[PDB]
Amino acid sequence: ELKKESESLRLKILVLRNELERQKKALGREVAFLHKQQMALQDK
Amino acid sequence: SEQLQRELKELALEEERLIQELEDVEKNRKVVAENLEKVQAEAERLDQ
């Protein structure tokens, strides 16, 4: 049943997009924190 | 019916690309954690 298979994939996609955004935002924070610590070590 | 079959194939490729992208972000987060721990381990050495 396509209409169901289509809807299933659309919902899976919506959830993945939201998940990808949250993880990208986490990575962004983690990179900035790593860089801060790397530079702190460089600087002192 | 044809269109909707072509549609289904394109949605699967998009779903797969999002899954791959999430995988790749996790790969990145893992490296960042590993490198953070090495920097912290060295900082702790110096602070003693």
From Swiss-Prot, chain A:
Its domain of life reads Eukaryota
* Subcellular location field: Late endosome; Lysosome; Cytoplasmic vesicle, Autophagosome; Early endosome
Task: Kindly state the subunit structure of this protein.
Answer: Component of the PI3K (PI3KC3/PI3K-III/class III phosphatidylinositol 3-kinase) complex II (PI3KC3-C2) in which the core composed of the catalytic subunit PIK3C3, the regulatory subunit PIK3R4 and BECN1 is associated with UVRAG; in the complex interacts directly with BECN1. PI3KC3-C2 can associate with further regulatory subunits such as RUBCN and probably SH3GLB1/Bif-1. Interacts with SH3GLB1; UVRAG bridges the interaction to BECN1 indicative for an association with the PI3K complex PI3KC3-C2. Interacts with RINT1.
The protein's job, in short, is:
Versatile protein that is involved in regulation of different cellular pathways implicated in membrane trafficking. Involved in regulation of the COPI-dependent retrograde transport from Golgi and the endoplasmic reticulum by associating with the NRZ complex; the function is dependent on its binding to phosphatidylinositol 3-phosphate (PtdIns(3)P). During autophagy acts as a regulatory subunit of the alternative PI3K complex II (PI3KC3-C2) that mediates formation of phosphatidylinositol 3-phosphate and is believed to be involved in maturation of autophagosomes and endocytosis. Involved in maintaining chromosomal stability. Promotes DNA double-strand break (DSB) repair by association with DNA-dependent protein kinase complex DNA-PK and activating it in non-homologous end joining (NHEJ). Required for centrosome stability and proper chromosome segregation.
Name used for this protein in its record: UV radiation resistance-associated protein
> What organism does this protein naturally occur in?
Mus musculus
Curated annotation (Swiss-Prot), chain B:
**Per its UniProt entry, which superkingdom is the organism in?**
Eukaryota
Q: Which residues form the signal peptide?
A: none
Disulphide bonds annotated for this chain are none
Which residue spans traverse the membrane?
none
Where, per UniProt, does this protein localize?
Mitochondrion; Nucleus; Cytoplasm
Q: What is this protein called?
A: Beclin-1-C 35 kDa
Underlying gene: Becn1
Question: Which residues of the parent protein does this chain contain?
Answer: 175 to 222 of 448
